[PDB]
Design a protein around this ligand. Structure first.
Ligand SMILES: *[C@@H]1O[C@H](CO)[C@@H](O[C@@H]2O[C@H](CO)[C@@H](O[C@H]3O[C@H](CO)[C@@H](O)[C@H](O)[C@@H]3O)[C@H](O)[C@H]2NC(C)=O)[C@H](O)[C@H]1NC(C)=O
Ligand SMILES: *[C@@H]1O[C@H](CO)[C@@H](O[C@@H]2O[C@H](CO)[C@@H](O[C@H]3O[C@H](CO)[C@@H](O)[C@H](O)[C@@H]3O)[C@H](O)[C@H]2NC(C)=O)[C@H](O)[C@H]1NC(C)=O
Ligand SMILES: *[C@@H]1O[C@H](CO)[C@@H](O[C@@H]2O[C@H](CO)[C@@H](O)[C@H](O)[C@H]2NC(C)=O)[C@H](O)[C@H]1NC(C)=O
Ligand SMILES: *[C@@H]1O[C@H](CO)[C@@H](O[C@@H]2O[C@H](CO)[C@@H](O)[C@H](O)[C@H]2NC(C)=O)[C@H](O)[C@H]1NC(C)=O
Ligand SMILES: *[C@@H]1O[C@H](CO)[C@@H](O[C@@H]2O[C@H](CO)[C@@H](O)[C@H](O)[C@H]2NC(C)=O)[C@H](O)[C@H]1NC(C)=O
Ligand SMILES: *[C@@H]1O[C@H](CO)[C@@H](O[C@@H]2O[C@H](CO)[C@@H](O)[C@H](O)[C@H]2NC(C)=O)[C@H](O)[C@H]1NC(C)=O
Ligand SMILES: *[C@@H]1O[C@H](CO)[C@@H](O[C@@H]2O[C@H](CO)[C@@H](O)[C@H](O)[C@H]2NC(C)=O)[C@H](O)[C@H]1NC(C)=O
Ligand SMILES: *[C@@H]1O[C@H](CO)[C@@H](O[C@@H]2O[C@H](CO)[C@@H](O)[C@H](O)[C@H]2NC(C)=O)[C@H](O)[C@H]1NC(C)=O
Ligand SMILES: *[C@@H]1O[C@H](CO)[C@@H](O)[C@H](O)[C@H]1NC(C)=O
Ligand SMILES: *[C@@H]1O[C@H](CO)[C@@H](O)[C@H](O)[C@H]1NC(C)=O
Ligand SMILES: *[C@@H]1O[C@H](CO)[C@@H](O)[C@H](O)[C@H]1NC(C)=O
Ligand SMILES: *[C@@H]1O[C@H](CO)[C@@H](O)[C@H](O)[C@H]1NC(C)=O
Lengths: 653, 200, 200
């Protein structure tokens, strides 16, 4: 039983190393009557003629596997593809020795393909490790629009989902296009200072020069790149201090040849010990069937641990890519690529030298640049945020408390009255109350200035699916905060599970629940028979697109009440309270604090039943906000000493 | 699961013995489909109370289905599934001709023919890129053949077919303009696997 | 599985690669145990995500566990597993002496000596049966040696032992009366040789 192996190499001397390696494997693994034969051909310029020569020289023989190298002249995925098709028709495994493209790891296209060197997509994983080492959470991902960039982005995002984190934003730029500065401009406006680039060498050079022109290479910024962006024309224009990484062997053709021959020999011996091995087709012409053993040979080849390689342990993952590779972390110090670590498959260990960050800093830079100007969206809630017209000269009227102390007020910008009568301009008005005083104390404590504006549509926020939409999106304050119009929500925003998935909440600054307001006390909460038996006689509803609507929608037992309420929901709390007082609405379901304050101050109305959904109000911020901890600590301290009690006495007695 | 010639027949029967569901959606090739359906019948997963839905990959040669395929198996194909080879060839040649017609009418000249197996130019010529663009969106005899950037069809008329009692693939539903049209108000379950009775 | 010495190995290796259970209970002799554990190591069922439990029969001399046995193998033995031969002989002679002493205390005479091989005493001779009954229920040094009518130890004090990292049969739990008292409130798991990996 003679076993024949084939190879497509470049220099015709690599063929001699291939023959020497096959001789070594044939002696180390007992020859007996196994006789591992070796045949080889050289790469050809024309791809079609290369495929035809693959049929005529290698497939014509009883080849069990084909090795394929990469010519020194850069042609990217062009050169190893033809073999992968011709050998892929018959399910003959083909091992790439130096190819790095991610398209060859897609087993639906390149069926019988394996590789001894990981693709570029795996450079994301090592990046992830650094994000764990230096605790970087807010990152920008600058990937090219080609398939390789998309693969890198997908791999990094999948890694981040396990950690349950997210990239700040992803910027896909068309390959080979100039003036990507516009995209970079967006990266400048973000709060993240870490940029992870995945592009070709020319695109890397373009991005480097554009970032240099925009002062993105200064202090506080961190650049993470792969080997494509720190070699060739990219290295010359690379800004100082960037961190790239290189595979240890990478371009060592001979080491990969030896390792591949070793793994192939081991797999061949195992396969012939398995019996029922049939025979390769012996010629492309005539034979139109796949090789029956092919899938079994590939399955044996993938499940192989050749822990004797020149390049270390040789093992494959679920799609043939080399698992557990070694990377060297390189830092550009004074126009020299100094090695400042090694990624040994699972961790990165710093060994020598000192990391020089792009701004010349000698200390680890944080991955964010929290601003001082804070755009704060707020809503008009009667005991928390009073909104009043300002006087003719553009300043708030001086007013003193009943105790005799000045009332702090802020200048908000809101939509004057409802939409039809509005002149459609953000008129400046005067905002004050519980939440405004809390915000003033919080800004004084945390040392940040602010500008306050009202929510455009006057809704707290919910998820809705408009017809002919590909996805649902938050409206109101939640949509404003998620879209970026606001940086922080200072309003009676209820904390619930639906909002918490997309939004970070501070520790509650006020505990309350849900209650029912009625005119003139004949309802026993939401367990009352009339509540569960709706009729046209009894009308009850809440404010549209609020926490109460979310609460009622998510309960199957309350579905009929949800339908009845939805048929008559109101636009705002004040309108529904007025409707209740005007005998137009019988019961109003809302927050305990607002409803209790309304009943106490206005009289003529009473709250009924016990609180049936206890929660609290919290300051809403974007996910993984750097100062979420500081806001929570400040709120806890305010609760502890006296501040919340003082606010309660002053505003809502 | 794991299908294929012979293979490890165990551990697929064990897994198919713990499938408790009224509706099953399967993905496999033709031979793997036959193996899976033989295993499922051995595991009592066919008959009334079980509905199978598969894409076109599992089907092969719609003219003659295997004996292992259960009746009531549901798949979705394109409208040209019932057309003859001559009609398919005519439709494809019509697509090419209409694309050439639109390109000539908009540019004022016939498109340049293709090259050879010789040295390839490299960068794509603007003429080749424009002919491709006019070749994508083509409508012919009412039904449109708009092509995706990925090279497949966008918004085609789709036909939901199912295997009837007579072991023949027959049309059951239509999908035009994003609106389903089914011929059965309630899904018929006339399979004759009531030997255990409890199976239903 | 056959688990015979030097026989069909591919047949059992095929089935051992299809097992997905995280806890495996085995029953075999010592040699079959070694063969089974070797094949399981070849099939990757020995790692930190697999627990093997076997009765006394599978193991042999606990003083020298074989190399094929994985760490964390669990078995249950009697409380005399760590006793020397002299101590066990003393316990047995004590049981016989206490039975004879009870029989004499009730009947006022020592039990009659046993017969001979060159005869067959067809009747049970209730003098013998009474002595057997007295031999059944015996307590000694605060240990219950009560014997079942099936002639084996009933309600005995059992201990649960396991093979630790140093490849020694360490004691883990006790079976005092009908209550389990075992160390290790969380079961420790080792990655093959070392590195006591912790569950995530
Ligand atoms: C790819 O990696 C190969 C091994 O990792 C490497 O082969 C090695 O080549 C070196 C010389 O470049 C040989 O070392 C020779 O010279 C030293 C110094 O005197 C002697 O100590 C050695 O005995 C020897 O004469 C290594 O022996 C050789 N190792 C092997 C296993 O081949 C290739 O050079 C690398 N190819 C590249 C980097 O392109
Ligand atoms: C949340 O509150 C934290 C405590 O007030 C605060 O940590 C403090 O951060 C400042 C930096 O602004 C540190 O000041 C040190 O660093 C600066 C700049 O590097 C130096 O100029 C100073 O001389 C000083 O060495 C404080 O030391 C540090 N306090 C503690 C206790 O660690 C956080 O920054 C706050 N979070 C925010 C604002 O998002
Ligand atoms: C063993 O491999 C050698 C290649 O080293 C094969 O010899 C080639 O055979 C083909 C077809 O007969 C010729 O086109 C080549 O010119 C030969 N190469 C050399 C260097 O002579 C040989 O056929 C193989 N033997 C077996 C039994 O497969
Ligand atoms: C590349 O893009 C940049 C940024 O969009 C262009 O620079 C702008 O060009 C417009 C003219 O359309 C002018 O407003 C200014 O010259 C630039 N404005 C800003 C805000 O940058 C540039 O013209 C584009 N083309 C190149 C660089 O060749
Ligand atoms: C990455 O490189 C390190 C060396 O820096 C490799 O570690 C050595 O690998 C050889 C090869 O088997 C062993 O003989 C040594 O004992 C290893 N040394 C140490 C300290 O572990 C490592 O194997 C390489 N990565 C891979 C996946 O092989
Ligand atoms: C509150 O913030 C202001 C400005 O944001 C700080 O004023 C300057 O902050 C920079 C930031 O490092 C310092 O370098 C300057 O020295 C500060 N100015 C002065 C006059 O000291 C201010 O220090 C902050 N207050 C704190 C941190 O307590
Ligand atoms: C099919 O698509 C092509 C490509 O968009 C259309 O060609 C365009 O025709 C308009 C005139 O109506 C020109 O202004 C565009 O420049 C053409 N595009 C290109 C890329 O040349 C063509 O009209 C479409 N066919 C139909 C029937 O609408
Ligand atoms: C062990 O069991 C034997 C057999 O039941 C007990 O012997 C009996 O003792 C009672 C007590 O007076 C007598 O009435 C019976 O006649 C005895 N039967 C026989 C067959 O001897 C003995 O007492 C038990 N020992 C203990 C410690 O409980
Ligand atoms: C970048 O920094 C230089 C340094 O002086 C400055 O002149 C230039 O205006 C900066 N570019 C900006 C702010 O866009
Ligand atoms: C090997 O092939 C023979 C004939 O093709 C067949 O009878 C036998 O079952 C096969 N052995 C396997 C599948 O283990
Ligand atoms: C705001 O709206 C009121 C209507 O109540 C109007 O009287 C006032 O002039 C408006 N303010 C403007 C347009 O600045
Ligand atoms: C779908 O949404 C559009 C958006 O304006 C609307 O005009 C149309 O009437 C909607 N169709 C419905 C509700 O059937």
């Amino acid at each position: 039983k003679i076993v024949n192996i084939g190879a497509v190499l470049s220099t015709r001397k690599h063929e001699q190393m291939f023959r020497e390696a096959v001789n070594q494997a044939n002696k180390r693994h007992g020859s007996w009557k196994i006789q591992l034969n070796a045949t080889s051909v050289t790469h050809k310029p024309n791809a079609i003629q290369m495929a035809l020569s693959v049929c005529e020289d290698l497939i014509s023989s009883q080849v069990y596997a084909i090795l394929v190298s990469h010519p020194p002249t850069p042609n990217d995925h062009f050169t190893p593809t033809p073999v992968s098709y011709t050998a892929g028709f018959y399910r003959i495994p083909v091992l790439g020795l130096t190819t790095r493209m991610s398209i060859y790891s897609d087993k639906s296209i390149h069926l019988s393909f394996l590789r001894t060197v990981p693709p570029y997509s795996h450079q994301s994983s090592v990046w992830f490790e650094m994000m764990r080492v230096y605790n970087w959470n807010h990152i920008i991902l600058l990937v090219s629009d080609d398939h390789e960039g998309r693969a890198a982005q997908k791999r990094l995002e999948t890694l981040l989902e396990e950690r349950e984190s997210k990239a700040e934003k992803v910027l896909q730029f068309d390959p080979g296009t100039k003036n990507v500065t516009a995209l970079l401009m967006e990266a400048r406006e973000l709060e993240a200072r870490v940029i992870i680039l995945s592009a070709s060498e020319d695109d890397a050079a373009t991005v480097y020069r554009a970032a240099a022109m925009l002062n993105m290479t200064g202090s506080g910024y961190v650049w993470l790149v792969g080997e494509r962006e720190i070699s060739g024309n990219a290295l010359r224009y690379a800004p100082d201090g960037i961190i790239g990484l290189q595979l240890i062997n990478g371009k060592n053709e001979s080491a990969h040849i030896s390792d591949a021959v070793g793994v192939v020999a081991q797999a061949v011996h195992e396969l012939l010990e398995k019996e029922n091995i049939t025979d390769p087709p012996r010629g492309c012409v005539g034979n139109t069937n796949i090789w029956k053993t092919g899938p079994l040979f590939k399955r044996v080849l993938m499940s192989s641990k050749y822990a004797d390689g020149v390049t270390g342990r040789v093992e494959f993952n679920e799609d043939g890519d080399r698992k557990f590779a070694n990377y060297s972390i390189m830092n550009l110090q004074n126009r020299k690529l100094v090695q400042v670590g090694i990624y040994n498959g699972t961790h990165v260990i710093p060994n020598d030298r000192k990391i020089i960050w792009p701004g010349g800093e000698t200390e680890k830079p944080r991955g964010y640049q929290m601003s001082t100007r804070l755009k704060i969206v707020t809503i008009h809630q009667e005991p928390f945020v009073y909104v009043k017209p300002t006087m003719s000269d553009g300043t708030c009227k001086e007013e003193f408390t009943v105790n005799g102390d000045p009332v702090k007020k802020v200048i908000c910008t809101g939509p004057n009255d409802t939409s039809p009568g509005s002149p459609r301009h953000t008129v400046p008005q005067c905002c004050y109350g519980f939440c405004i005083d809390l915000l003033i104390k919080l800004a004084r404590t945390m040392n940040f200035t602010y500008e306050v504006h009202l929510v455009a549509d006057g809704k707290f926020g919910t998820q809705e699916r408009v017809n002919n939409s590909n996805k649902k999106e938050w409206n109101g304050m939640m949509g404003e905060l998620l879209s970026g119009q606001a940086d922080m929500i200072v309003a009676p925003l209820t904390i619930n599970n639906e909002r918490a998935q997309y939004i970070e909440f501070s520790k509650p600054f006020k505990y309350q629940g849900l209650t029912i307001l009625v005119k003139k006390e004949r309802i026993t909460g939401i367990n009352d028979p009339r509540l569960r038996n709706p009729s046209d006689k009894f009308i009850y509803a809440t404010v549209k697109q609020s926490s109460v609507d979310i609460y009622f929608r998510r309960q199957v037992e309350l579905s009929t009440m949800y339908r009845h309420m939805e048929k008559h929901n109101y636009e705002s709390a004040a309108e529904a309270i007025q409707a209740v007082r005007d005998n137009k609405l019988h019961a109003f379901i809302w927050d305990s604090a607002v409803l209790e304050f309304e009943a106490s101050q206005k009289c003529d109305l009473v709250t009924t039943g016990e609180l049936f959904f206890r929660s609290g109000f919290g300051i809403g911020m974007r996910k993984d906000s750097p100062w979420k901890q500081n806001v929570s600590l400040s709120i806890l301290k305010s609760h502890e000493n006296g501040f919340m009690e003082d606010l309660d006495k002053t505003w809502v007695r | 699961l794991e299908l294929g010639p012979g293979g490890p027949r165990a551990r697929t029967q064990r897994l198919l013995r713990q499938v408790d569901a009224p509706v099953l959606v399967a993905y496999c090739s033709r031979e793997e489909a036959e193996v899976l359906f033989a295993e499922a019948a051995q595991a009592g997963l066919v008959g009334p109370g079980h509905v199978w839905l598969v894409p076109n990959l599992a089907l092969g040669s719609t003219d003659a289905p295997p004996a292992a395929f259960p009746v009531g198996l549901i798949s979705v194909v394109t409208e040209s599934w019932r057309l003859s080879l001559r009609q398919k060839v005519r439709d494809g040649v019509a697509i090419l001709a209409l694309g050439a017609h639109s390109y000539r009418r908009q540019y004022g000249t016939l498109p340049a023919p293709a090259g050879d197996c010789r040295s390839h130019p490299g960068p794509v010529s603007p003429a080749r890129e424009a002919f491709y663009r006019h070749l994508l969106n083509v409508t012919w005899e009412g039904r449109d053949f708009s092509f995706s950037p990925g090279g497949y069809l966008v918004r085609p008329t789709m036909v939901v077919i199912a295997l009837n009692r007579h072991r023949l693939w027959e049309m059951v539903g239509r999908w035009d303009h994003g609106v389903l049209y089914m011929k059965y108000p309630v899904w018929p379950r006339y399979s004759t696997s009531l030997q255990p009775v409890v199976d239903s």
